[PDB]
Amino acid sequence: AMESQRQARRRDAPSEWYDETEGPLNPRFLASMQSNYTQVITELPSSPVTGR
Amino acid sequence: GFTMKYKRGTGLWDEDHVNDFDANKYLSARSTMRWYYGMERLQTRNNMNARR
Amino acid sequence: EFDADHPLPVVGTRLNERTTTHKWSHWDQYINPQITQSWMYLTQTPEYVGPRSGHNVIKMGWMKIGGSWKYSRSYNDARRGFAKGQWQERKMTPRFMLAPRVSAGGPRNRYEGKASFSRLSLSKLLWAVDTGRLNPNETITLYHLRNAKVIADREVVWPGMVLLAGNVERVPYPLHIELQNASAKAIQLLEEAGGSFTNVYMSHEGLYQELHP
Amino acid sequence: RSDIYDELLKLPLRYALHDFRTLQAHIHASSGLSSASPDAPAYYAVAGRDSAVGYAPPLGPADPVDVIPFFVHRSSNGHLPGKVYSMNAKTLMPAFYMRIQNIEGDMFRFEEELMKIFPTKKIFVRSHSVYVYNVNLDGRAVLHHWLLGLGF
Amino acid sequence: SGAVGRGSFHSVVAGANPRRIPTYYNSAYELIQLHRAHREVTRNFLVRDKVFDNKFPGCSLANGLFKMVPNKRGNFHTRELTESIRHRTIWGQRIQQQRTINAAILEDATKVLSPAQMEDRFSYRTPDAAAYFSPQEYTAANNWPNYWQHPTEKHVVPKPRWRREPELGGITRVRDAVATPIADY
Amino acid sequence: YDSRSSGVHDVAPRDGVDFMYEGPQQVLPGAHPLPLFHPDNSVTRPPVSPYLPSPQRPHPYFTTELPELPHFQTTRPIVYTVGTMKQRIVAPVFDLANNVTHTRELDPFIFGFYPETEEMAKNLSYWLVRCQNFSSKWDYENREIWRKAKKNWPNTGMGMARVGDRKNHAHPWGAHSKPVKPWNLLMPTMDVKTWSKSNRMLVTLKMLQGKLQIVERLTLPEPTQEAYLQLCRTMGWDVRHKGGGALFMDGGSRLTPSSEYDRAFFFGSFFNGRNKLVRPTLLCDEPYDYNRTSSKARTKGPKGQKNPIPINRFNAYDALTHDTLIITEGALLQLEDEMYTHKLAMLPPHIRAQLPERGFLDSEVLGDVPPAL
Amino acid sequence: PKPAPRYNIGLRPAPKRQNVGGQFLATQKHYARELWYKRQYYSTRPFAIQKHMGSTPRILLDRTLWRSCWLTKSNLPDVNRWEKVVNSQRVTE
Amino acid sequence: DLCAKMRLPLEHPLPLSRRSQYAAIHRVR
Amino acid sequence: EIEALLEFHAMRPEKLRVRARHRPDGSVNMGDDPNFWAQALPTRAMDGSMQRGLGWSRRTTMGANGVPVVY
Amino acid sequence: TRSSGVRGPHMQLMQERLDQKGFGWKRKSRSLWQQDVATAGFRPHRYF
Amino acid sequence: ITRLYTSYFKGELFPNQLARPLERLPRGVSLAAARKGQRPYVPLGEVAKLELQGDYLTEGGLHQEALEYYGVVAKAYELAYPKDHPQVAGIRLKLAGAFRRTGRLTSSKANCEAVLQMLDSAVQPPLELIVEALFELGLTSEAMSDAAAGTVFEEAVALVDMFHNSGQSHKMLRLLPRLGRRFNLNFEEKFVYFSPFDYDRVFALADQCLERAEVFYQARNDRAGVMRVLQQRKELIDKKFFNMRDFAGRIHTMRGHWKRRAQVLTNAPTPDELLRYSPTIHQVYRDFKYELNAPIGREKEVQPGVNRVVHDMGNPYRRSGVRSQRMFRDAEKNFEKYIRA
Amino acid sequence: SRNGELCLQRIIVSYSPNKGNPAMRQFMATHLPEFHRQYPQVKIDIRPRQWPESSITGIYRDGSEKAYSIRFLSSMGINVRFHRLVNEGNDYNHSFSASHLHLQ
Amino acid sequence: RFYRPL
Amino acid sequence: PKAGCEEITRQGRRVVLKPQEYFAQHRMQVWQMRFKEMGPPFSRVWVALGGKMRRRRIGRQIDVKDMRYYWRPIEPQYQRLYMSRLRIKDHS
Amino acid sequence: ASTAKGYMNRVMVYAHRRRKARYLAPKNAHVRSPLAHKMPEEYGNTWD
Amino acid sequence: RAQHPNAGTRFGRVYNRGFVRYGFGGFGMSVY
Amino acid sequence: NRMLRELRLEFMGQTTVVPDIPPVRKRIWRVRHVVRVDQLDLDEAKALIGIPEHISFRDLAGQIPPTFGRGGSVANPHMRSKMNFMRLRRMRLRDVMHRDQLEKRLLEERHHALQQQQQ
């Protein structure tokens, strides 16, 4: 059943939770959320994420 | 004397309503196997005792 | 510093050079729970200073341990404990013996069968009925009062209760009760608002079968 | 009581209080029916609508523009968080302190509104509560006439 | 016995109870102690059927019997379990009875003036309930426990100009210049 | 103090690690302006959380529903009691294969109960006492010594000590007068009223610290231990003795919740490392002390409650010694179920009367709703 | 309700029967020093030989005591080789 | 005293709803 | 005065006997003074600390009929 | 009046066992057929 | 024993008397970088007494007479200290505030615009000055009936909202309510309060600039501005109050535990330098080349040394007999399948 | 300080980068990088080791040394004990008295 | 119980 | 081997849990009949009857044969003595 | 002189008790004397 | 023995040189 | 000793400046054998400290605050310690009556901004 909805998640890039103006993202977690996308996620710059 | 005998099996698990003051902070690998095997024993050690 | 170019030296005192590492107070852990990192950070209530550490000798403050026992002549004597089975008053005709025996059982004695009720103030019962613990429709017998946690086990001892119109100048809705010995005002309060009060006065055998039917 | 409510209506308190008359749960079929909506169809009332004891839901905020910085919850049984314990009950000492136990928010912006009430009672703040000392069951009555005025 | 509105047999005196069907009551607290009581009777049947699953082979030799002596289980079923069903049934009536009245109230009331105001006349919408249910809507108070993060007080916490450090291993590291602390007197 | 003003140090750098301090820009290992006795960064004990716990973020989790994942609302409808966080929580639950499947919203009463140290201390001070080996604290008593009960020399005229029947605690063969026996040691009575609070303010702390991890199923392919380290290796948990462990509250899958652990995992969870499979609950029954005053004069026992919390419930000690917490949804279903009627009984009345309107008291015994899971 | 006497439990080793202290305080037994190595009062700290009081030691080095005396035969098997923990492993350098 | 001050003809027992003369009317003031 | 004769003569005696260790004013009625074994006004130990310290008015003290209560 | 009062339904009724004499229930003890093993023996009011 | 303080009683020692550091603007920042975004023997002992006597005159209301004193101090100060000095910028600042009382706004603003060009050119100016430096310039701007540019007050605080550690002011004073151990005599020591309008001058000014910014918009009738003055000002005071917050310690009277004072008067990070430097955000750089472990993957970065043989898990049951070591056999070979990469 | 040049050379700082008592780890981030600016000619070396030899110890250019216990001692105190090292020269021990007001 | 007899 | 090395090998009597007392022991009956404690919280007199009310009446003063009839408090010096045996229930 | 650590710790060489508050009146209590409980000007009143 | 603080010299009695002369009265001791 | 206490004199060598009002004249009289007095006419005091002749002293004192060192002498060292307490409270309230007076003005403006918003 869940695959019906998981594959109804077009987002090949992270949503706007991928913001970190509040506080830095967690590198461990991204590696666990890389599966749900196509573009790379873990690669975070030295600066706070801009959003793209 | 009177020791709440109507509570021995009327717990939700096996380790409940059995007063065992002999505990420890960190029960190790085989002290935990010794523990779980212990609660059930004096739960079946008691029963088949009381059945015989 | 009168001038910034001559900074005042750091030559510490017994109020700086002798300190200790800041343990985390219950505020610093309330602000930033990112620091309570081990169970040695769950220190006790601030009011609990620690275990007893001194001899509260009477007539002389609280002495330290290892202190002087020149003045504990009566602490070594108030640690044995009060005389047991012995008149407290050594001389002077004990104040109890001076007063006369009254009412051969006592001034407020409870014999087997005394009619001493626990007081259920009407304000309590009226407070509940609006709060919603008690249903105003169903004649509110003591089962409802007990099971709705209006009154606990430690207050229903035979015989059940007594309704007391405490400061309740008015009861607004028709209220029905089956309790034991309402006070005459409490009766004339329910009876004015179209209610009832049929005082059940059950034996103890009836007190059980009403609470655990 | 109105007599106490002045000693709050006189204070220089931010977060103003409800006017006294509109703070009252105590005031046309037959000169108007009772409060708890017993309507004309043979008088069906609604259970928690009238209370002769003085219980009622919180009246609400003081004024819409302001945001109160503390929130004092109610107990599981309805009444308010003020409790007057005693110093050293074991010796039956008649020297009492209060305890405001069920509050959340910033107690300091709450306790900084008790100070303006009791400019002379030692008030201490803790994580859960707010101890105010040397204030007995009449101070318990001053609080609730305030925690009602604040609208909680 | 009382325990429901039927009146205990102590209406031996023929105490009637007129002016009835008078109150709509949502049975709030009673439905609570029903879900509490319904949990017990199920949490009791779980016990009355405990049967040895000895995950160990030391004392596996009873893995078919119940965990309670036949005479005791034959008692506990009758002492505590079947009692808890009656105690569950009691709330299952004090509510099924009170609903019957509400079913009658909510009809004779819906008519008179409005089918819109009706479920407002019978409501309990305190102005603050947004505090307890949907706290995102509530503004009129600051009821967070971590109050310094309420949107009207977020301006307390400082927003550090942080940064990562790949030379340290991707550790985040604040770029605040520490203020030289006080030292002596 | 301040004695030993010399000889404590060698005037020589160990030719290996030792090193001068280069400058203010030098980032020294371990250095930090806060007094931390467990200086852990995010590479040693890395938090399993979407974001790192920041003062800005009220909690390092999805405060909102993220669009690219199935959202599963709580098993029970939610209300925000006195202490709760008044902020929505959404914790993503992890597939066994380390993938992140659907995100699940947590209960703001169990996992939203903000911490306050002095009310988990009542939990810790209970554990650091309940977890003694009371029966070990025996000690010989004056009477229990078996020596002559008769003065062999009555002290009459010479300079012998004013002592006889020397079986008291002064002499190297004696025993105490008021010794420490187990039946004289208090096991503290711990209420469910505060055990629940003292568990909820921790399993929130383990959420605010961002060490909270939800797993779909804690099941192994086979019951061998090696399959449980292989599982930990994919999930990244550190059950090594030194690397902070893991606290599994095994409740089973999302649709098959169960209290008795998955027999597969239970046998596989016997690794010598740092891990502790605890029971999926936070409550425990009312305490009772049948030997309240002295009734049973032969019990060995401690004094106090004769129904101590067992060793494998969720306590404060093993909650702070184990960094990461690993809850299956099959436990979340049990925790929300067992605390529902408790969460509701604590709301104030002007709220409690609003529940049946908002759909909180749907009682499957009356049939107004099909039975919940 | 009334919270337990942590007294000194989990931190430090048991105190020794002071003048003061409740009945619930579990001191140490008669004729048993609270500090194992202080056989005298000036016996100095053993260098790398700790006694593991409390639970079963998580990682028992060969050179620490566990319900036992010190045996130059069994405690330090080879005096030239010297152990430690590395990644939770009892290695010997 | 209560009936006269209210200009009411005397009544006794003066039931408790009538007593507290509709909130003890405050003697009109 | 006629109203007071009754309000004093329809009180059960126990409402008049000495009833507390602290006389309504705050003193501590010890024994040996037969006058002070009569405590007409009932004392209230836990009540009244707002008066005389916070500048609370004397208007609050008084009861509904005007006569002051004591604390 | 000394022994006056309303006694409980199981208190010793006024002058029970006394038989009209001061502390007379003691004098009537030797008259008892057989007493218990712990029966109102000697007890001079010392620190009584 | 009640004291009288007639004969000289030497001052008591108390943590409210520390030598706090004068608030320096950080290193890599200069004034205008933010402002354009918006010795010889000189008897300084004689002029310090003189420059003080100017204050008492400008505080009393003899402004013209205080002008002539500050002149002298503005002459001895520019002789002792070199160019660009901060203190020589302090006196030609109050001097510029001395003209404005006496209407000479032609030199007041001019002598006050020069303290900026004397403060910016510096390396690390005191943020106590540069916030007054343009608070004055704000007032003399308006005193010239310049109604807008007199509201650089907004930019006066536009530093202290950025570059002011609002917690360094009460770092040591925050914890004094714990030093009291008495409750019913000598108990004012549990309520030791020090107003931030004494122990913080850069805060006071910041409160006073915005207050003057409230009345400049009160006349100009800029109600959208008077709010962003007030809603700014309250967020300035409430975060300063926030750094004085702490929960009460033991409330009743404690006895004897006098060594506890080594725990109260310490480096208690104020709730500003706590939320700011939280360990999770500001992470502790831990280099495993000094430690004795690393996460599973990195098991080769650790403390190096001479030959190491990995024996086994240091499991304690290796000291038992043989039937205990026949168990525990397949422990280690299972543990390598847990640390292999 | 003698003829403008300090009489102290090294300040040995033995600490543990991970173990406990952060006083030192808490000092090397707050104070030490600022005491490093006033007295840069002091060769502060630090010693990460498992059992921290808890004593600060200055090695004066006269060859002599002076230690200082830092057991249980907070950062602000360690700051002082640092400035207690750069001040004294460890060159003489005189009772401040009558015969010792004028050294020579 | 058997009460402590003193 | 350590406590006495021969006193602990040969065995004497072993002590066990010590039975408690009647934990309403100190409301003894020479007060449950003589006095009665009246009063609101935090003020409990122990009012006691007159001293001379049964022994010698003929010839005593006319207005002092009745001071024996009032429920007088017992002076607090005895209130604290008798109520001391009751406080001990849970000291500290 | 001989001042030693504190107000009221003056001369400390005479053997009087410092910290004794000589100003405060004696608690004469039970003792019978004309000097009882009287402000010193009322000493001549030996009739009350 | 009446052991009360304030009944004599607080803890025992000592003869420092400021006492052996300048006793109570200034004359001051009978011995020493 | 009581008179000396009412002259602010306990230790030998202490010194105070008391007025010549009548009830001081007795206090000094009783202890004449203890003190060493000196009298100054007020003009001989207005010059001992350089004072203009026109300024009286009931305007010089009307300037010093009444809370000078050891403000009051209340009836016992407790009442002293609750006279210094509240003095350290009316400081707290002085900043708190300050911090809301900022809010009450912003609140009365947020009302007018809202009110006039609809017009």
From TrEMBL, chain E:
This is Uncharacterized protein. It comes from Leishmania major. The lineage of its organism: Eukaryota, Discoba, Euglenozoa, Kinetoplastea, Metakinetoplastina.
TrEMBL record, chain F:
GO terms for cellular component: cytoplasm; ribonucleoprotein complex; ribosome. SUPFAM superfamilies: Ribosomal protein L4. Keywords: Nucleotide-binding, Ribonucleoprotein, Ribosomal protein. GO terms for biological process: translation. GO terms for molecular function: structural constituent of ribosome. Belongs to the universal ribosomal protein uL4 family. This is Large ribosomal subunit protein uL4m. It comes from Leishmania major.
TrEMBL record, chain G:
Keywords: Ribonucleoprotein, Ribosomal protein. Coiled coil: none annotated. GO terms for molecular function: structural constituent of ribosome. One of its GO terms (cellular component) is large ribosomal subunit. The keyword Ribosomal protein applies. The keyword Ligase does not apply. Signal peptide: none annotated. One of its GO terms (biological process) is translation. Belongs to the universal ribosomal protein uL22 family. This is Ribosomal protein L22p/L17e.
Automatic annotation (TrEMBL), chain M:
Coiled coil: none annotated. It comes from the Eukaryota. Transmembrane segments: none annotated. Belongs to the universal ribosomal protein uL23 family. This is Large ribosomal subunit protein uL23m.
